[PDB]
Design a protein around this ligand. Sequence first.
Ligand SMILES: Nc1ncnc2c1ncn2[C@@H]1O[C@H](COP(=O)(O)O)[C@@H](O)[C@H]1O
Length: 279
Amino acid sequence: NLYFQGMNIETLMIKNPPILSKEDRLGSAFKKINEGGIGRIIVANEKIEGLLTTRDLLSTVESYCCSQGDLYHISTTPIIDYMTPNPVTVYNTSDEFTAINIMVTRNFGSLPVVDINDKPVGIVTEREFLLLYKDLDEIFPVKVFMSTKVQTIYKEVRLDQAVKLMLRRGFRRLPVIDDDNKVVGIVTVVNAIKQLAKAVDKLDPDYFYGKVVKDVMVTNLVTIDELASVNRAAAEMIVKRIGSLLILNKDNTIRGIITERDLLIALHHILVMEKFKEK
Ligand SMILES: Nc1ncnc2c1ncn2[C@@H]1O[C@H](COP(=O)(O)O)[C@@H](O)[C@H]1O
């Protein structure tokens, strides 16, 4: 029961997360965005001012289909123009359950952690709460928390179109299918931002607009049985360094997807329920 027995959220947080100042430009952000695999940059000087997410950065090309000049202008854009200002944060002395509740109820994939003077000291993301499953009973199967009406994309579809769809539906990841509707990969916002970062760095739109999803997608298919525990799902996500697991039909078509967001939702439920069972 020791992961739940931490004095506070400092037990879980990533220290030294990527930070930039409000005076910095998006070019610098494109270089740092995937540092530590966080996928977000805290914007701060003395105090936290904003949070620049992967979505925030991918939105820079939302109204293009994009010149060398356009990419240069993105590169030189002040971070303040795209950051989420006044982000929700937790204090370093605060508890793990409150952080889970915030993320679950208000739909945040990360919380900056700040000290009493509002200075950033760390960050917690969905990934950091996966360790809490080590101390838990096996209560729920993957089937209960997986999503089943899975949005997929065909493997030859343009990456810019993949991005539009992800941003529109609010998914970080789309399983990729072939001619027989079999799953051949997963394209992710991390994939997409790697490519957009290259396009921005080189002022060359081809790195983003010239790619199809099969060119950049994750090709490791990590699957799980829908009757396996959410704890096993969590453990596997930690070991395989991924944020989703696929549930496949016998014919290798998609049945469902379970993500670290789903596992956070489930964890919230487990914790709330263990409050009741002690009654
Ligand atoms: N491609 C997808 N199709 C349908 N649901 C998804 C997809 N990707 C993620 N989800 C679900 O959408 C929610 C957000 O997950 P995430 O994309 O990890 O932030 C979770 O309930 C996931 O199960």
